[PDB]
Amino acid sequence: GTSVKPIFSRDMNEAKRRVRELYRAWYREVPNTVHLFQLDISVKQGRDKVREMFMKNAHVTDPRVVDLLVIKGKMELEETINVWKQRTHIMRFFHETEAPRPTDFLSKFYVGHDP
């Protein structure tokens, strides 16, 4: 039961197809984005960041969530291609100015009360 209305895909396979299309488009766009924005990162680590962002949502098991994430990624790609962003928006993906938050129990115990 639990009948719901499709957004774009009827099942998971079409969702995977759209995900692969978006990943292909991003993988093409990475070098041109790196050159045009005069970024200090390399193409390798930019594509690694794209891979990491795609892996961040690897646990989704619902076509509606999957293709809505695809829609948001397509919006981000459109923003990046049309040079609507500045270097700051692109560089925000890397968090180069944020201190590295430790994970072990001792470090969190020493720094403060935050688990």
Partner 1 sequence: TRPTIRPRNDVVHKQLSAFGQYVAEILPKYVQQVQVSCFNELEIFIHPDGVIPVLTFLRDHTNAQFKSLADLTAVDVPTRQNRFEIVYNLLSLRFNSRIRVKTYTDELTPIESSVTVYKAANWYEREIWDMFGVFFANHPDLRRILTDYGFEGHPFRKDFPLSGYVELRYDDEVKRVVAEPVELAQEFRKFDLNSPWEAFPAYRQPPE
Partner 2 sequence: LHHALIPHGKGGRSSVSGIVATVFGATGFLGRYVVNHLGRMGSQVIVPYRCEPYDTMHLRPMGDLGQIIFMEWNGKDKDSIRKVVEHSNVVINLVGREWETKNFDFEDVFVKIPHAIAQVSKEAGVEKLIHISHLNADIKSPSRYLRSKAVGEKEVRAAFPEATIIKPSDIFGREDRFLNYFASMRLGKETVKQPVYIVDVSKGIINAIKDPDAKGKTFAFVGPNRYLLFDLVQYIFAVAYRPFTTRDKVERVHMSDMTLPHLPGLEDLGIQATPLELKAIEVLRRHRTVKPAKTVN
Partner 3 sequence: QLIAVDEKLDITTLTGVPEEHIKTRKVRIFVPARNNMQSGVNNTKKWKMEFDTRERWENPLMG
Site for partner 3, residues 41 to 80, rule: CB under 8 A: 56-57, 60-65, 68-69, 72
111 binds partner 2 (CB under 8 A): yes
Binding-site size, partner 3 (CB under 8 A): 24
- Interacting stretch for partner 1, rule CB under 8 A, among 9-17, 50-58, 75-83, 105-113? 75-83
Q: How many residues does the chain have?
A: 115
End-to-end CA distance of the chain: 40
> Are the C-beta atoms of 35 and 80 separated by less than 8 Å?
no
Q: For partner 3, what does the binding mask look like between residues 1 and 40, x meaning CB under 8 A?
A: xxxxxx---xx-----------------------------
The tokens for 92 are: 């925000």
76 binds partner 1 (CB under 8 A): yes
89 binds partner 1 (CB under 8 A): yes
Residue 57: CB minimum distance to partner 3, A: 5
**Per-residue H/E/C for 51-108:** HHHHHHCCCCCCHHHHHHHHHHHHHHHHHHHCCCCCHHHHHCCCCCCCCCCCCCHHHH
Which residues contact partner 3 by CB under 8 A? Answer: 1-6, 10-11, 56-57, 60-65, 68-69, 72, 101, 112-115
